[PDB]
Design a protein around this ligand. Structure first.
Ligand SMILES: NC(=O)c1c(-c2cnc3cc(OC4CCC4)ccc3c2)nn(C2CCCCC2)c1N
Length: 464
C-alpha cells in the first residue's frame, strides 16, 4: 500500500495553516511540484470514521473548479494524513490588497463573484466549508489579475478544530451564528462571505469586540449597521446584498447561487462601467490596519509557542545525547547526532520538514555546516543542541520582528499602550496579565514599547 515519501520529497515549508503544516513537495519521478498539508493525528481529532473521510477524499479528487484548490492525492500512515494539492504562489488575498494603490466596488465585486462561484459549485456537490475567511483565499499566482482559490473546502467536516488561540485567532469575525448553536447547513458559507464582503467595502468587521468572546457575542446577536462614514461612498445595491447574506435565519438568507444573480454583482462585474467608480481610500486604509494587527497578534502567539517548543525540545534532545554518551565524554559523532535527532522526532514528531530519515541527515549537516569543523568528527553534543534549536526558532523570531515592523506603519519604532491593548485583546491575553508584564520589563515606561521590550514582554508571558 502506498507511502507518501516513496513518491514526494520535501523542498521547503510554505507555512502553518488550519489543521497542520503545509510543505512544498516534489514528485521524485515527474518533478511535479505540490503543496502538501500534513495533519498530525496526535494534534487533531477526527469527527468521522475512516470510511466517511476516504469517500469525501475520493469525491474531492474528482471535483474541478477554477476558484477551488485542486486536490490530487491523499495518503495516511500511523501518525499523519498527507493531503496533496496544487501549489499557489500569489499568497493571501488581503496581503495583496493592502499593497494596492486603488480599490473600488468593482474590485470587490470581481473578488466576491469568484468566491461565490466556487462556493455554489461546492454546494451543488454537498460540501460545506464552514470556516470560510480571508486566510482561505489564496491568489493563484503573483499576477495582478490572479484567480482566487479557496483552500480547505471540506476539512471542517472531518477534523476537529484546535481550541488553541494560536490556531483559532481571526476565526470569530466570520463564523455564522448557527454554527455556534450546532444546527448549520451550507448557508453558513454565505454568511461568512457576507462578512468578508462587508470588510472589503469598509475595512472594519461588522461584528467586532475587544476579545474573542466579545466578538462571538455580537455575532450571536446578529446586529451590525452601515453607519460609519465610509459607507457613504458605497452603493445601495452592495448594502442590499450584504443585508441578504447577513440575514440571521438561514432559510431566509440568500443562497450562493442567487447571490451570484444579485444586481450588485450583475452591475459591478460587467466590466464596462469600471472607469467611472470611486476608489475606497478609507476602506483600504482600515484593511491595512486590520491586517497588520491580525498578523502581529498571530506572530506573537507563534513566537510564544516556538519558545515553549524550543524549551521542551532542547531539554529532550540533551537527555537523548547524554543517555547516548557512554563516553561520559560529552563528545559525540555524526551518525549518532542523526540517530538521536531521529529519536527526538520519534517521540516529538512535530516536523513536517523532517518527513524522512534523509531530511534529518541533511538538517544535521546544515547544523554542522554552521558549526566549526569536521562535519564527520566526534562532536560535543551541547554546542550542537544550541545551534540546532536556534535554527528551528528564529524563523519565528524573524517573523515577529517583521510583523512588528509592518505594524509600525509610521516607522516610530514604537507601539502605544492602546495599540498593545488591541494586539493582546485579539491574542486573548488578559489585560491585567500583560499590564503587569509591561510594568516589570520597563518600570519607568510611558505607555509605549520598542521591539526589544515587546519581545521581552512575550517572553515573560510564556514563563520566561
Ligand atoms: N495549496 C497551497 O498552495 C497552499 C496551502 C494549502 C492549503 N490547504 C490545503 C488543503 C489541502 O487539502 C484539503 C483540501 C480538501 C483536503 C491540501 C493542500 C493544501 C495546501 N497552504 N498554503 C500556504 C500555507 C501557509 C499560509 C499561506 C498559504 C499554500 N500555499
Amino acid at each position: 500500500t502506498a507511502i507518501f515519501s516513496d513518491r514526494y520529497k520535501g523542498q521547503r515549508v510554505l507555512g502553518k495553516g488550519s489543521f497542520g503544516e503545509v510543505i512544498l513537495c516534489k514528485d521524485k519521478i515527474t518533478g511535479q511540484e505540490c503543496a502538501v498539508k500534513v495533519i498530525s493525528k496526535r494534534q487533531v481529532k477526527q469527527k468521522t470514521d475512516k470510511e466517511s473521510l476516504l469517500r469525501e477524499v475520493q469525491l474531492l479528487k474528482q471535483l474541478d473548479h477554477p476558484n477551488i484548490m485542486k486536490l490530487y492525492e491523499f495518503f495516511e500512515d500511523k501518525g499523519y494524513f498527507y493531503l496533496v494539492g496544487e501549489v499557489y504562489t500569489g499568497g493571501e488575498l488581503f496581503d495583496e490588497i493592502i499593497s494596492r494603490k486603488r480599490f473600488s466596488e468593482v474590485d470587490a465585486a470581481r473578488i466576491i463573484r469568484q468566491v461565490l462561484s466556487g462556493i455554489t459549485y461546492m454546494h451543488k456537490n454537498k460540501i460545506v466549508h464552514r470556516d470560510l475567511k480571508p486566510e482561505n483565499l489564496l491568489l493563484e499566482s503573483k499576477s495582478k489579475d490572479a484567480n482566487i482559490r479557496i483552500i480547505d473546502f471540506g476539512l471542517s467536516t472531518h477534523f476537529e478544530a484546535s481550541k488553541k488561540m494560536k490556531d483559532k485567532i481571526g476565526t470569530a469575525y466570520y463564523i455564522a451564528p448557527e454554527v455556534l448553536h450546532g444546527t448549520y447547513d451550507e448557508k453558513c458559507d454565505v454568511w461568512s462571505t457576507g462578512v468578508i464582503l462587508y470588510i472589503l467595502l469598509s475595512g472594519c468587521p461588522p461584528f467586532n469586540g475587544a476579545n474573542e468572546y466579545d466578538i462571538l457575542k455580537k455575532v450571536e446577536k446578529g446586529k451590525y449597521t452601515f453607519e460609519l462614514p465610509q459607507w457613504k461612498k458605497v452603493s445601495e445595491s452592495a448594502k442590499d446584498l450584504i443585508r441578504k447574506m447577513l440575514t440571521y435565519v438561514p432559510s431566509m438568507r440568500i443562497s450562493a447561487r442567487d447571490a451570484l444573480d444579485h444586481e450588485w454583482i450583475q452591475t459591478y462585474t460587467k466590466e464596462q462601467i469600471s472607469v467611472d467608480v470611486p476608489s475606497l481610500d478609507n476602506a483600504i486604509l482600515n484593511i491595512r490596519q486590520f491586517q497588520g494587527t491580525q498578523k502581529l497578534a498571530q506572530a506573537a502567539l507563534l513566537y510564544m509557542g516556538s519558545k515553549l517548543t524550543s524549551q521542551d525540545e532542547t531539554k529532550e534532545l540533551t537527555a537523548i545525547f547524554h543517555k547516548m554518551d557512554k563516553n561520559g565524554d560529552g563528545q559525540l559523532d555524526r551518525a549518532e547526532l542523526i540517530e538521536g535527532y531521529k529519536e527526538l522526532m520519534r517521540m516529538k514528531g512535530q516536523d513536517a520538514s523532517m518527513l524522512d530519515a534523509s531530511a534529518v541527515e541533511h538538517e544535521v549537516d546544515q547544523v554542522l555546516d554552521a558549526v566549526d569543523f569536521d562535519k564527520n568528527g566526534y562532536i560535543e553534543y551541547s554546542e550542537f543542541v544550541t545551534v540546532a534549536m536556534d535554527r528551528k526558532t528564529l524563523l519565528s523570531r524573524e517573523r515577529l520582528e517583521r510583523a512588528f515592523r509592518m505594524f509600525d506603519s509610521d516607522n516610530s519604532g514604537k507601539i502605544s499602550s492602546t495599540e498593545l491593548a488591541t494586539i493582546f485583546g485579539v491574542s486573548d491575553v488578559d489585560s491585567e496579565t500583560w499590564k503587569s508584564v509591561l510594568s516589570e520589563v520597563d518600570k519607568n515606561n510611558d505607555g509605549e514599547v520598542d521591539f526589544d521590550e515587546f519581545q521581552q514582554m512575550l517572553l515573560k508571558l510564556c514563563g520566561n
